[PDB]
Design a protein around this ligand. Structure first.
Ligand SMILES: [Zn+2]
Length: 223
């Protein structure tokens, strides 16, 4: 169960390599305004996180599927489809806060190390074509990085805290899920755990300025 973990510095390098490989199959958004907006919400959430140990980069990708995913080394990809599906900035932030916390807790590199072993992960770091196999399998359009129940719970727990500290209503993620119904599996357990975490916080009115969100969403539906 225990394993040798690569260093923060080594993971920065792993992320660099994954990023360039993953991006070969993506169509980027090259819209400074959309870029600026996602950067802002991401930066705001990071101010609420427990540890910011990477220079986080938020990349918006042209893809109608509803997804966001962190890769090793603090790089978070956000699909245009997610931005278009979100009803408000709070929903968007809820999804982003969960993914940021997978990065904060180093879940990607932990899961890869438990699955493949330290030697393989270290070899990715050093670049010993294996890196290309893994990019596709973990992070491509049919690719499932899949996190243990424990890591999902951690990302949920931290995401509620992150949202709260950043001044967003922590119900954002579950609200997004409800709207969607009207691989990060939203199980009975996760709903119960998230509701309990939210229940422990002081009741308060969450203030939002949806100006920028509505502008950006508007621009994306034009594409
Ligand atoms: Zn997750």
């Amino acid at each position: 169960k225990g394993f040798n973990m690569i260093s923060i510095e080594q993971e920065k390098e792993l992320g660099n390599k994954f990023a360039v490989e993953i991006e070969k199959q993506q169509q980027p958004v090259n819209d400074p305004e959309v870029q600026r907006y996602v950067d802002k919400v991401g930066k705001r959430l990071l101010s609420g996180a427990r540890a910011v140990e990477f220079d986080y980069v938020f990349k918006v990708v042209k893809d109608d599927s509803v997804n966001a995913f962190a890769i090793p080394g603090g790089r978070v990809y956000v699909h245009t489809g997610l931005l278009k599906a979100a009803d408000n900035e709070t929903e968007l932030a809820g999804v982003l806060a969960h993914e940021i916390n997978h990065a904060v807790a180093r879940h990607g590199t932990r899961q890869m190390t438990q699955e493949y072993g330290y030697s393989l992960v270290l070899s990715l770091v050093l670049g010993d074509n294996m890196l290309a196999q893994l990019a596709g399998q973990l992070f491509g359009k049919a690719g499932m990085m899949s996190y243990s129940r424990e890591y999902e719970n951690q990302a949920d727990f931290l995401g509620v805290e992150t949202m709260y500290k950043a001044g967003y209503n922590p119900n954002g993620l579950t609200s997004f899920f409800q709207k969607l119904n009207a691989t990060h599996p939203l199980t009975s357990e996760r709903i119960q755990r998230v509701q309990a975490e939210i229940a422990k916080l002081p009741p308060q009115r969450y203030l939002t300025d949806e100006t920028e969100f509505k502008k950006i969403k508007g621009r994306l539906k034009l594409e």
